[PDB]
Design a protein around this ligand. Sequence first.
Ligand SMILES: *[C@@H]1O[C@H](CO)[C@@H](O)[C@H](O)[C@H]1NC(C)=O
Ligand SMILES: [Ca+2]
Ligand SMILES: [Ca+2]
Ligand SMILES: [Ca+2]
Ligand SMILES: [Ca+2]
Ligand SMILES: [Ca+2]
Lengths: 334, 338, 190, 191
Amino acid sequence: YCSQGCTFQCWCEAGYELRPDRRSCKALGPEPVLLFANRIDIRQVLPHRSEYTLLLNNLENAIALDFHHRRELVFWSDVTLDRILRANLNGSNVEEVVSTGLESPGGLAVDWVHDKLYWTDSGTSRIEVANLDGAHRKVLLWQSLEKPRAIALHPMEGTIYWTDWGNTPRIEASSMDGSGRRIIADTHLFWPNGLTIDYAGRRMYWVDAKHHVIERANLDGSHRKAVISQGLPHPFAITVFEDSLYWTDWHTKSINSANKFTGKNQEIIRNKLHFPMDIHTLHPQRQPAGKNRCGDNNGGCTHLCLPSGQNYTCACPTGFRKINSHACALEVLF
Amino acid sequence: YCSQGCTNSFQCWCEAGYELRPDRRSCKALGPEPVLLFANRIDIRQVLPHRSEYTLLLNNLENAIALDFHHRRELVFWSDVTLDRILRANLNGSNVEEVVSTGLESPGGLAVDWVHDKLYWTDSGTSRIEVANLDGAHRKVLLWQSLEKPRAIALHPMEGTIYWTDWGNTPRIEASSMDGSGRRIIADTHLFWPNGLTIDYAGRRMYWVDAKHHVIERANLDGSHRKAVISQGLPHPFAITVFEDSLYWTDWHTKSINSANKFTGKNQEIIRNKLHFPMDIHTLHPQRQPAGKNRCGDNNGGCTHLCLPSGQNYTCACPTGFRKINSHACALEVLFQG
Amino acid sequence: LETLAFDGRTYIEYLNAVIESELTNEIPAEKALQSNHFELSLRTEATQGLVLWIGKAAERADYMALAIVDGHLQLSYDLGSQPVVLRSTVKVNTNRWLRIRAHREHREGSLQVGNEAPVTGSSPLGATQLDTDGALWLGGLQKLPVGQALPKAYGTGFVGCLRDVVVGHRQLHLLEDAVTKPELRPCPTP
Amino acid sequence: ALETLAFDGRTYIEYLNAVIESELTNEIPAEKALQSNHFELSLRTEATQGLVLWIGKAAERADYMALAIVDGHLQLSYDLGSQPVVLRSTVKVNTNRWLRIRAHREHREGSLQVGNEAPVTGSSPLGATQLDTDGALWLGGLQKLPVGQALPKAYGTGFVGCLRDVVVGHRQLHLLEDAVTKPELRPCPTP
Ligand SMILES: *[C@@H]1O[C@H](CO)[C@@H](O)[C@H](O)[C@H]1NC(C)=O
Ligand SMILES: [Ca+2]
Ligand SMILES: [Ca+2]
Ligand SMILES: [Ca+2]
Ligand SMILES: [Ca+2]
Ligand SMILES: [Ca+2]
């Protein structure tokens, strides 16, 4: 639809150049790479060519994953080991991040702006946050959570989106401090497995594996649309780049692709995969630079500085109580 | 007929804190009249044998099983199985506090070292024998290997020995040093349900109860000269104790406290019946906690944490979650992990 | 086998399988429960009813309850932390027998009525055990609700028939196990 | 239906005990962690040695629960990650008469009962309450033993005899139609 926007002429945004078709915005910089967890592996695949890049070689059960493009890091969850890990993007030096309090860590999200990590546990029915190293861990959300699975962030807007496939399945959003919580869609869902935000396109996409649909809504949940109504036997995770959607399917053990607008150009990027799980488009434009709300006043308040609404707030790591608005103290002192 | 010992052949002799009776044979303990302390699951109670005096010491307990006492500190310890706790209180029934909270499944046996101020206990559900300070600090797993269902436990601070019963799939009765070393089998034969166990210090002999074979056995302290004493009226005995010439035990079938002659097994009496659920029993008396030398001596002997009798002297030991350093000191293994 | 029938005023009390120390020589006790499993068959015309109560008779709440809400079954339990509620999609009333598989392991619990896909979920974190006083109640309760803000259906006696009772792995004897025997009837033949 | 099974020593039958049916449940696939095991079976044999039932994976140092005949006596063994425990029955099984077996595990605590004997009870050592399984349940023995060699010689031997009325968890087994992997199936011959 003239891709990003047309105010006729077509308008591209920075990091994107208008293609001769005059509609398409091709991404500036390196080539896009599909990053996914094969449960036993984490592989980088080039989508419109045939490629296999073995990143992490020996794993028990990798599901949720994400990256910090600047700083070149790869985070992923292991649900058998019940640990969260990180490594350089090249796949060097595996490092434990979250070693405790995990049961079924199904979601993972990295804030490249504020350098924070958000993850969901369907077993613990909680959403948690910490520093990229694992420091200053806090429980962001707990009450009224069942099976939180997919999680995506909007560091620029300081907003968090996630999915719950529990007894009352829903897609929800809150500020990165856990405030301003609202329902995005609590209707016509059953298995909301995956979620993704198109930053340039300013829209959100999700998959329901029971309804076998990929849906686009505006970013507040408005103008809900199903873009793909077929060939979705058991989809799991979904991602976006340019005019294409990419997702993994458990039935076909494959990475699939189609057009965000028309839903056409159905494609199988790869198949015969062990057990494809979570997927991201590895590219600088998929992690757009933005204003750091917490950066350069006092770094992360005393402990945690989290974006809230039009501003930021200071929060206490678990085991801490708040001292005024800027500080925290341990729970055993008082 | 000599309650304790006869030397010179044939006149009987009496140990310190004891006095020969008019019969010239029996030994009577100097001090107050003996008191029987026992656990009733819901209560901890006291009785004066051969009289009707019956006193409820501690009330509103969940499941009170094993109990022991510290005479000179006026302390009483007991374990609670439904709670998975080990508590202590003043002998009066006041100032009750939690000693062991975590890591208990079925703490069915208790023993107080009144000489070294230590607390030993057994857990059949945990298959371990653990030791701690009177308050429950410096907690260390003393014995784990080969244990299945440890129940009864009895100490000999003077000999520096630990005795216990295992009624598991390989029924036994074992002795060891108080540090856990020098372990040995007293009896692995003709045992099935070795429920009760007690030590006669003055007589230098040991008694125990098998709820399956239906016997009270007397043994030399090394396991030798093993003899059945009571072969009858033992439907389901649980705990047992000795005082002077008398044996005292509890029974689940009869819901009663029973007595019989030590060397004979006659004079079988029922001290109390209609009891709720008789568990662990004892004789409350200074002579049942005689004075001995503290191997650690000057409290500097406490090493860094644990100082336990082993062989003829002692060894130093580390509580759970600690590493041994230099043989006198212990340090947390968490300072060696990072 | 056998069928216990319930008029709505029928509330039958059972003990949880006890320790026989006589035979086992094992120290008697009743600890709070790690896990529960209930298998039972049900036939009813009723829209709402309290059916099963595994509970602690202290008025603070530790409970495991299976009850009918608006023709559909519900499994709910409070472990010390807040409760979890699992609704069976299948409707209770065609006056036809239905198989019920209720189970919980710590926080995690499941419910399956008939051939439906089982409904899973977990009670809130924290307490993973169920405080118990050896009581297993059937046909609803004597109107002895515990001062909890439960659905008003949990105060209503159950009308219908039961059979093939399985508590854990033990087959329950409907008549002989009852500590409370108000009156007993085989299920009528509608 | 086929109510009885005959095992010639080479008969190894696979059943799916408890797996993660991600396709039906939409849950993340993984090895299931088991707090509790329970099964029942009737057995008739003249054998004094052999493997009868196997739960868990077939791999080195992988968790397991096994019911095996050793020196004419049935026994229950299981390793949860901490060391293994063995529960030996007091009944001679080679009487060639039908025998009921009842096995149960709550975390570390297991029990075994053959016929009307007093149940044999014990615990696996502290530290592991759960048995991690691929959902595999094996009947009649194993083709090749899990590669970590700590087992007795009898565990290698395939079961010779018959089987019926097999309870697994809360579900009674359909010996024929529930079998994931099986050779040709014949009822017990000498009733
Ligand atoms: C026991 O003595 C202590 C200290 O004198 C006292 O606090 C307590 O009240 C006494 N016991 C009872 C039951 O009164
Ligand atoms: Ca897990
Ligand atoms: Ca700040
Ligand atoms: Ca010293
Ligand atoms: Ca509880
Ligand atoms: Ca394990």
